[PDB]
């Protein structure tokens, strides 16, 4: 499949006790495919609360997402972990499920050297035989990969490019300049327009599973050169995103899904599991102003 | 005058002993006006080696720049300093010289509170009666001003906006959204295109006093919606800028001015005063590839 | 048991394939008890490569260490995780093994609020009924808990104090002023003397695996006010630690164990699994100079 | 003179208009010598609000302090600046006054290379013929010099050691190991005990202006190995310092001086020039609790 364009970073529905709610998770997937009209899903990312889950849970989410989506859309499986043996086990499972590409966060917590980082990517690829997308998220991992280092990663022909949840647009431009055949997916939804202006190939975003219509319009208008209109739509989206961030990101996207009848459920502990009354009321105001 | 568009951050020619070379400084000003075709000059900024100079030297530079440029172009005088009494003295002098606006760096070194910062801006404005442009450069000062704080600064009607040498494009978009009548000048030349895509009103840049032709083309093509062409010109400019940064920023821009017959002189100690042979040869290669 | 004094952060022996080497792990435990004469072991900390391992592997390590040590020394089980359900499962298992206290890293990766972090500690305690030591390691997690926040955690009376792998000695002194009955274990071996001078109750350290004799001397001499002699031993200790850090921290402590007959094995991928030959020779030099 | 021991970082008395109050500055100097019984004064440091002042004002302060103190105590002149020609002019003037050593902050604001920083120290020394103390204050300048780099500075035999306003006690111990004949003055008053335990040669501190008696006791008791008694005095000291930091550091030390009859005056804009009335009462509480 084509891996360009708009990918929601899939949110997962949890029950009160923190178990996966399969019915809810399917409604989320269905909603992204049918109503947000995404090109694909990025499953197991930070937005899916992935790092708070067990390996078996992560497998269940991969299985459920793929069974619901089938081949209607492109699917990318984020399998990265500080535990390389887990990342390999997950990448094999996702590959056998038919995921179109793997993705892996740079290994974190410990301060890994660049050679260790590369060996981690190469090891997942060798064990799975699947494509790989580097998942770069410096504001969470503390890891900053430079132009020449991405090029060493790109010496492995199964590495397709980078899910770039980073805000350095000089680095962004330089990666496009040096590796014009490798892909970049912008990761910060509130900076989609300036990333689109630099020729990114698509975007992966949490807010796309409620705002995926505007997200597509910004992306398409910008790359068609209609910046005045793309900018307008970016301004309204950033009103919504500022609202969502203030109110509590994952819970608030989930609340916005609930207001459209998607049983998007609780967040997983240790995240706060549920919005207070006041925050529910604020999310309803966001819905009325921006998504109704 | 109109303060929109392309402003070179003026470089200053020094002699071997660190004194200002007036003939050189005039040739720099002349070159920006006549060959780079800038809309204005930003005098006394970080690029002018301002923070390594005495108050009397800074005054001489203001006097010389204004006497050479006259009213051919817009002139902005950066007068900020950890010493508020110096900043007031400089802002008065620049105002009496006819500078179109003042600008001041956020006070630095000490960790000033936001109220102290605002009192500094308001004090300069009250003493001078001139317009003020906030000079925000977090990667040097460590000071990060937020949307609501810019709005408190903008309660003073003589504050025109911000010289934004910062790379947070979410903040950038938010400032345009909240204060659509206040101006923003992008400060990172290697990120001009994505800043132009968000509707900045112009740019202040060191590299414009050798690359001000391409800088204008990126700015105009982007805001006319021709992103494919603006992107191309941004890629070549960033090859040049990457070169310049690797070789030594201020010295290398000065070397590029010398290759066009501008006596751009030495840098001021404690900066390295002169390029080595090897670095001169590299700057000549930059000239041959990008500016000939 | 008395939980004061010298605790080695237990290293784990791995096979070439990343699996646990039980014989090797047992010999490490024995070497600590019998040769390093430690007061206890801190098991499953960052030093034990814990965050690269499966839930089952962590349990296996808890089981082995307890089996070897029996009740000859104190044992603390680090059970913290970004996965709260994992932390609870591990905390219950270590509690059933008869671990003298649990400990848990502040939840990391995601940017959790202080209420969420407190809820995480309280939930582990509620589920296990065991003592809890907060594991604070800001340079790996980016989380910095302040004096008032420690006080809120200390409202739970099963919270004993803090494994303070942190370098702020004003915070350290302030915690002892505020909470004089709560314990502190210093976590930077190379700053043992100044931490001991502030009246910490013990220390938890990776290098105590090989240098536990000097570590006890620094600690005991410092608390007796014999600073001249403590400082001497700290200088030699720090020559060794500087060499260990330059050569590769966990690999080099393992090599130093191997040089004494202990089957300390490989590191676990994605860490580099073995030293280069050059670095093996360097560990031999350290052994000859500092440990023979 | 012997440059070891307890040095207050001299505060400066300002008038309402920001000018120097000579009578007030003289009374501060006298209070230090006569009541705080300091070994010396560190004049023109960050504590003296130096970086907010003109060249002439700095000279006036050097002149006054020397005039009052004569040879009753040691005197060190902080003459560092981003302006090297300024540092040289000040260094020559303080040397002509008979200052026992110069000192200079690492050049800041710009991102200077280590060679440029060394050239700056060497140039000041060459121009003045006086001793030099490196002033290291990473939390204000962002500059962190490492052990090998200190060694390169120490190749100049007029470099005596370092005013270490820094909190890394591994670096501290490593500097004493490597350069045992070079001096270190600890610069964080609230970490005096652990610094003294590592064998620093003295301390330079703003709070010594009002708490010099306890500061000498902590320092002397620590070096005698009377840690229990040193720690007590450090706890009380740190109750006072925590209150001073919460209330506004330089203003509150000035208020505490005023409460003893010393005309310590205002702070200099852009610092807040005087305490709110509420905070004046709070300084009175500190005085009653800690200093009467
Ligand atoms: C950490 C995070 O949530 N990042 C989001 C963003 O879409 C982000 O939520 C949004 O731009 C607001 O910050 C995307 O990059 C997708 C992603 O990294 C993920 O799977 O979490
Ligand atoms: C610190 C600095 O040089 N900034 C330049 C940039 O133009 C910069 O030189 C360029 O983008 C490369 O980093 C501009 O922001 C202008 C400026 O701040 C200045 O006066 O120095
Ligand atoms: C991160 C780490 O390894 N820290 C060690 C230290 O002993 C450290 O290895 C030593 O001070 C060298 O920096 C201890 O704090 C124990 C600990 O946190 C651990 O199990 O990792
Ligand atoms: C930045 C500052 O004020 N530092 C003081 C300290 O004494 C400090 O005020 C005190 O430890 C409270 O943090 C000393 O290091 C002396 C010094 O650097 C100075 O003159 O500012
Ligand atoms: Cl970032
Ligand atoms: Cl390519
Ligand atoms: Cl920035
Ligand atoms: Cl406005
Ligand atoms: Cl207590
Ligand atoms: Cl020495």
Domain ranges of chain D: 1-292
Burial (CB count within 10 angstroms: exposed 0-12, middle 13-18, buried 19+), residue B148: exposed
Question: How many residue pairs from chains A and B have C-beta atoms closer than 8 A?
Answer: 78
- Would you call B116 and D272 a contact, using CB atoms and an 8 Å cutoff? yes
Distance, in angstroms, between B115 CA and closest chain A CA? Answer: 24
Neighbours of chain B (3+ CB pairs under 8 A): A, D
Give B173's contacts in chain A (Cβ within 8 Å). Answer: 190-191, 193, 234-235, 238
Contact present, B58 and B99 (Cβ < 8 Å): no
Token pair of D48, please?
């003296």
Measured from the alpha carbon of residue C111, the closest ligand is 1
The pair of structure tokens assigned to D286 is 């500190």
Which residues have their alpha-adjacent CB atom under 5 A from ion ligand 6? A 179, 181
Query: CA of C238 to nearest chain A CA: how many angstroms apart?
Result: 21
Sign of the dihedral defined by the CA atoms of residues A148, A152, A153, A159, in that order: positive
β-pairing verdict for B101-105 and B74-78 = parallel
Instruction: Give the closest ligand to the alpha carbon of residue B188.
Output: 2
Q: List Cα–Cα distances, A39 to A5, A181, A216, A238, in angstroms.
A: 6, 20, 10, 22
Q: At what angle do helices B55-69 and B84-97 cross, to 10 degrees?
A: 20
Determine the Cα–Cα distance for residues D157 and D179; give it in Å rounded to an integer: 12
Which alpha helices (DSSP H) does chain D contain, by range? 22-34, 55-69, 84-97, 114-128, 138-141, 147-153, 169-178, 192-197, 208-223, 227-247, 249-258, 277-290
D88 three-state secondary structure = helix
Helix, strand, or coil (residue C59): helix
Chain-chain contact of B269 with D83 (C-beta, under 8 angstroms): no
* SS3 labels along B231-283: HHHHHHHHHHHHHHHHHCHHHHHHHHHHCCCCCCCECCCCCCCCCCHHHHHHH
CA D189 to ligand 4 center in whole angstroms: 7
**Region of residue B73 (left: phi > 0; alpha: psi -120 to 50; beta: else):** beta
Count of positions (residues) in chain C: 292
The set of residues, in sequence order, having a beta carbon less than 8 Å from that of C175 and lying 6+ positions away, is C147, C150, C162, C164, C182, C184
Q: Give the CA angle between residues D10, D11, D13 to the nearest 5°.
A: 135
- Within 8 A by CB and 6+ apart from B286, the residues are B240, B243, B244, B247, B252, B256
Distance D139 CA to ligand 4 centre (A): 11
**In the numeric block, which tokens belong to residue A250?**
């994952």
C12 lines ligand 3 (CB under 6 A): no
CA of D177 to the centre of ligand 10 (A): 9
Token readout for B75 is 């002139």
In this structure, are strands B202-205 and B5-9 parallel, antiparallel, or unpaired?
parallel
Helix A208-223 to helix A22-34 angle (10° resolution) is 20
Which chain C residues are within 8 Å of D226, Cβ to Cβ?
A: 225
Angle at the Cα of A176 (from A115 to A155), degrees rounded to 5?
Answer: 35
User: A 116-145 residues with CB below 8 A of C?
Assistant: 116-117, 119-120, 123, 140-142
Rounded Cα distance, A216 and D210, in Å:
64
Q: Find out whether A193 and A199 touch, Cβ atoms under 8 Å.
A: no
Strand pairing category for D202-205 and D5-9: parallel
CA distance A169 to B277: 33
**Where does C59-193 show beta strands of DSSP type E?**
74-78, 101-105, 132-136, 159-164, 183-186
The pair phi, psi for residue D41, each rounded to 5°, is -130, 135
Euclidean distance between CA atoms C186 and C170, whole angstroms: 13
Ligand nearest the Cα atom of residue D147: 10
With CA atoms as reference, the chain B residue closest to A169 would be B191
- Among C28, C40, C206, C256, say which to mutate for ligand 3: greatest number of ligand atoms within 8 Å of CB: C206
Region of residue B225 (phi > 0: left; psi between -120 and 50: alpha; otherwise: beta): left
Which chain B residue has the Cα nearest residue D19?
Answer: B85
Q: Widest CA span of chain A, in angstroms? A: 52
- Exposed / middle / buried, residue C278 (Cβ in 10 Å: 0-12, 13-18, 19+): exposed
List of chain D residues whose C-beta atoms are within 8 Å of the C-beta of residue C192: none
Task: Give strand pairing partners of C163.
Answer: C135, C185
Torsion-angle region of D129 (φ positive above 0: left; ψ -120 to 50: alpha; else: beta) = left
CA distance C200 to chain D (A): 12
- Tokens 């802002």 label which residue? B91
Q: What is the resolution of this structure in A?
A: 1.9
Pairing of strands B5-9, C159-164: unpaired
Torsion of CA C92, C97, C102, C106, to 10 degrees: -60
Beta carbons within 10 angstroms of residue D100's beta carbon = 18
Q: Identify the DSSP state of C37.
A: -
Domain D1-292 classified CATH 3.20.20.70? yes
Give the whole-angstrom CA distance, residue A271 versus residue A180.
Answer: 39
Ligand 3 atom with minimal separation from the C50 CA: 20
Nearest to B231 among A199, A238, A239 (CB): A199
Give yes or no for a contact between A145 and A112, defined as CB atoms under 8 angstroms apart: no
Ligand 3 pocket member C187 (CB < 6 A)? yes
State the Cα–Cα distance between residues D67 and D28, nearest whole angstrom: 13
- Tell me which chains share at least 3 CB pairs under 8 Å with chain C: A, D
Cross-chain residue pair D271–B108, CB shorter than 8 Å: no
Helix residue ranges per DSSP H, chain A = 22-34, 55-69, 84-97, 114-128, 138-141, 147-153, 169-178, 192-197, 208-223, 227-247, 249-258, 277-290
Judge whether D85 is closer than 8 Å to chain B, CB to CB: yes
Report helix, strand or coil for C204: strand
Asked if D190 is an interface residue toward chain C (Cβ–Cβ < 8 A), one would say yes
C274 touching A (Cβ < 8 Å): no
Q: Is the CB of C136 under 6 A from ligand 3?
A: no
Q: Would you tell me how many other CB atoms lie within 10 Å of the CB of residue B209? A: 27
A91 and A128 Cβ atoms separated by less than 8 Å: yes
CA–centroid distance, residue C39 to ligand 3 (Å): 17
Instruction: Name the packing angle between helices D22-34 and D55-69 (round to 10°).
Output: 40
| Tokens (6 digits) for D29 | 């100097």
The C-alpha angle B122, B123, B128, rounded to 5 degrees, equals: 100
Confirm if B88 and B127 have CB atoms less than 8 A apart: yes
Q: Given CB atoms, is C249 within the 8 Å cutoff of chain D?
A: no
Burial A73-94 (b: 16+ CB within 10 A, else e): bbbbbbbbbbbbbbbbbbbbbb
- Three-state SS for D79? coil
C271/A110 Cβ within 8 A: yes
- The structure tokens 């609790």 sit at D289
State whether the Cα torsion B114-B119-B124-B129 is positive or negative.
positive
- Name the neighbours of A, counting chains with at least 3 Cβ pairs within 8 A: B, C
Say how far apart CA C190 and CA C185 lie, in whole Å. 14
Specify whether the backbone of C168 is left (phi greater than 0), alpha (psi in -120 to 50) or beta: beta
Which two structure tokens, joined as six digits, stand for B287? 């000239």
Tokens 């990120």 locate to: B191
Q: How far is CA D93 from the centre of its chain?
A: 19
Distance of alpha carbon C162 from alpha carbon D221, whole angstroms:
28
Ligand nearest to the CA of B159: 8
Q: Is C108 a pocket residue for ligand 3 (Cβ < 6 Å)?
A: no
Exposed e or buried b per residue across A18-27, where buried means at least 16 C-beta atoms within 10 angstroms of its C-beta: bebbbebbbb
Q: How far apart are CA D64 and CA D57, in angstroms?
A: 11
Size of interface C-D (CB pairs under 8 A): 83
Which method resolved this structure?
Answer: X-ray
- Name which residue sits closest to atom 9 of ligand 2, judged by CA: B206
Is residue A245 classed exposed, middle or buried when 0-12, 13-18 and 19+ CB atoms within 10 A define those classes?
middle
Backbone φ and ψ for B10, nearest 5 degrees, come out as -65, 125
User: Measured between CB atoms, which of C177, C223, C234 is closest to D238?
Assistant: C177
Residues 6 or more apart whose Cβ sits within 8 Å of residue B180: none
Residues of C in contact with D238 (CB under 8 A): 170, 173-174, 177
- The separation between CA C237 and the C-alpha centre of its own chain, rounded to angstroms, equals 17
- φ, ψ of residue C223 to 5 degrees: the values are -70, -20
Residue B101 contacts residue B127 (beta carbons within 8 Å): no
Q: Which residues line ligand 4 at a C-beta cut-off of 6 Å?
A: D 9, 45-47, 137, 165, 187-190, 204-207, 241, 249
User: A150: which residues sit within 8 A by CB, 6+ positions away?
Assistant: A134, A162, A175, A178, A179, A182
A285 Cα distance to chain centroid:
26
Look at C174 and D238 and tell me if their CB atoms are within 8 Å. yes
Helix, strand or coil, per DSSP, at residue C102: strand
Q: State whether C120 and A272 contact (CB < 8 Å).
A: no
Cβ distance B169 to A194 less than 8 Å, yes or no, reads: yes
Interchain CB distance below 8 Å, D269 and B142 = no
CA distance A193 to A218: 6
What angle is formed at CA A12 by the lines to CA A7 and CA A18, rounded to 5 degrees?
Answer: 160
In this complex, which chains have at least 3 CB pairs below 8 Å with chain D?
B, C
| C237 shares contact with chain D (CB less than 8 Å) | no
Q: How many CA atoms, within 13 angstroms, populate the side-chain half-sphere of residue A89?
A: 14
Cis peptide before A270 (omega within 30 of 0): yes
Beta bridge partners of B105: B135
CA distance B283 to A77: 46
Q: Helix/strand/coil (H, E, C) string of chain B?
A: CCCCEEEEECCCCECCCCCECHHHHHHHHHHHHHCCCCCEEEECCHHHCHHHCCHHHHHHHHHHHHHHHCCCCEEEEECCCCCHHHHHHHHHHHHHHCCCEEEEECCCCCCCCHHHHHHHHHHHHHHHCCCEEEEECHHHHCCCCCHHHHHHHCCCCCEEEEEECCCCHHHHHHHHHHCCCCEEEECCHHHHHHHHHCCCCEEEECCHHHHHHHHHHHHHHHHCCCHHHHHHHHHHHHHHHHHHHHHCHHHHHHHHHHCCCCCCCECCCCCCCCCCHHHHHHHHHHHHHHCC
Chain A residues in contact with C110 by the CB 8 A cut-off are 46, 51-52, 140, 271
Cα gap D139→B109, rounded to integer Å: 9
Decide: C237 in ligand 3 pocket, CB within 6 A.
Answer: no
Residue bearing the CA closest to ligand 4, atom 11: D188
Output b/e per residue, D244-256; b: 16+ Cβ within 10 A: beebbbbbbbbbb
Residue A42's DSSP bridge partners are A9, A76
Three-class SS state of D167 = coil
Residues B99 and B160: their CA atoms lie apart, in Å, by: 14
């Amino acid at each position: 499949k084509n891996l360009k364009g708009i990918f929601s970073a899939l949110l997962v529905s949890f029950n009160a006790d923190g178990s996966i709610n399969e019915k809810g998770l399917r409604q989320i997937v269905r909603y992204n495919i049918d109503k947000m009209k995404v090109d694909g899903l990025y499953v197991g990312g930070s937005t899916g609360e992935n790092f708070m889950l067990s390996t078996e849970e992560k497998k269940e989410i991969f299985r459920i997402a793929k069974d619901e989506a089938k081949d209607e859309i492109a699917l990318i499986a984020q399998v990265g972990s500080v535990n390389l043996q887990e990342a390999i086990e997950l990448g094999k499972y996702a590959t056998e499920l038919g995921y179109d590409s793997l993705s892996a966060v740079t290994p974190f917590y410990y301060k890994f050297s660049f050679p260790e980082i590369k060996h981690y990517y190469d090891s997942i690829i060798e064990a799975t035989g699947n494509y790989m997308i580097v998942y770069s998220i410096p504001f969470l991992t503390g890891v900053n990969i430079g132009v020449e280092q991405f090029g060493e990663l790109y010496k492995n022909p199964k590495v397709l490019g980078v899910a770039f949840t980073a805000g350095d647009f000089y680095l962004l431009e330089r990666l496009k300049k040096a590796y014009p055949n490798h892909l970049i997916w912008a990761g910060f939804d509130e900076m989609m327009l300036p990333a689109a202006s630099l020729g990114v190939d698509g975007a992966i975003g949490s807010t796309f599973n409620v705002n995926g219509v505007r997200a597509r319009q910004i992306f398409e208008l910008t790359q068609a050169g209609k910046l005045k209109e793309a900018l307008e739509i970016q301004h309204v989206t950033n009103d919504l995103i500022e609202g969502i961030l203030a109110n509590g990101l994952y819970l608030t996207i989930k609340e916005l899904l609930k207001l459209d009848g998607v049983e998007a459920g609780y967040c997983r502990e240790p995240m706060t599991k549920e919005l207070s009354s006041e925050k529910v009321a604020f999310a309803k105001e966001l819905k009325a102003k921006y998504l109704s």
